[PDB]
């Protein structure tokens, strides 16, 4: 069902496991080995509005702001069951851009 | 049957698990020492029981020849004996309950098992029953 959870676990660490629900989008940056989460970016758990696609694009810009003061740079995406298309792109495409 | 061809032997090691207890039956037969009981003393022991009492009883054979015999015919040494020239045998170790029957008293059944007990190369001891069921 999931695979790519394992696919990344081969390479490095720093799981960025994104959860997308019908009105909600939560994006962490979670590290294994130690098995502990870090930057817990969200929107329906933050306070951002509700237009979905163009809303993921900003939570994506949050981790950047939030993490680059924590010793972070290393991308390590974690697409869920989803397909790198809409909200997951916008969520992503702001990341390194942030 | 169906199985597949022929099989090695098996040194009757510990006179044990080849063993049971009088289940569905009144009296039964036991093994004092091991052997390879064949598909020809069984029937010979079977019919010997029936013939003691015409119209009566039910004999419960509890061993089955699932083993191949192997003999060569007067030749030398090559390959493995196709054999089976006597057929099949049943691995028998002591303690095993060979036969057991039901349907009569004992004076009409202390002998039917005494008889067939003579159709075996191994010493036997008739089992009364002893409700030691496990």
């Amino acid at each position: 069902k999931f695979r790519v959870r394992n696919r990344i676990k081969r390479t490095g660490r720093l799981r960025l496991s994104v959860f997308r629900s019908l009105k909600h989008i939560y994006a962490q940056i979670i590290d294994d080995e130690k098995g502990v989460t870090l930057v817990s970016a969200s929107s329906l758990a933050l306070k951002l509005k509700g237009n979905k696609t163009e809303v993921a694009r900003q939570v994506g810009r949050a981790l950047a702001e939030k993490a680059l003061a924590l010793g972070i740079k290393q991308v390590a995406f974690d697409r869920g069951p989803y397909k790198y298309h809409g909200r997951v792109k916008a969520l992503a495409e702001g990341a390194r851009e942030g | 049957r169906m199985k597949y061809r022929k099989q090695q032997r098996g040194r009757l090691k510990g006179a044990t698990k080849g063993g049971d207890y009088v289940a569905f039956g009144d009296f039964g037969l036991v093994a004092l020492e091991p052997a390879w009981i064949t598909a020809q003393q069984i029937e010979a022991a079977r019919v010997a029981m029936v013939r003691h009492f015409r119209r009566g009883g039910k004999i419960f054979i509890r061993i089955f020849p699932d083993k191949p015999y192997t003999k060569k015919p007067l030749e030398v040494r090559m390959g493995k004996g196709k054999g089976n020239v006597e057929g099949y045998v049943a691995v028998v170790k002591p303690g095993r309950v060979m036969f057991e029957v039901a349907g009569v008293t004992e004076e009409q059944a202390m002998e039917a098992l005494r008889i067939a007990g003579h159709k075996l190369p191994i010493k036997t001891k008739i089992v009364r029953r002893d409700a030691y069921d496990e």
Binding site: - | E75, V76, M78, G79, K80
Partner: protein, 82 residues
């Protein structure tokens, strides 16, 4: 005395040295191999890996260990460090 000739059942194949090479708690270097095997009986874990023939070889210098993921198989890892 002159009899028959032959069957079909003497062919065999020659040995493949199927085994675990280094064991748990053995210092291993870099590149060494740990499991020669048929299939994925022990699976590659931390700092291990396999090509082609299911051959568990240490990526980096350290100590070898076994943990049993019951369900998920059997896993040979590498403790680099020291």
């Amino acid at each position: 005395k002159k009899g028959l000739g032959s069957t079909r059942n003497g062919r065999d194949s020659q040995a493949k040295r199927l085994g675990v090479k280094r064991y748990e708690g053995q210092v291993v270097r870099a590149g060494n191999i740990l499991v020669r095997q048929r299939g994925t009986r022990f699976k590659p874990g931390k700092n291990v890996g396999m090509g082609r023939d299911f051959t568990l070889f240490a990526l980096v210098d350290g100590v070898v260990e076994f943990q049993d993921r019951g369900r998920l198989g059997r896993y040979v890892h590498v403790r680099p460090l020291a």
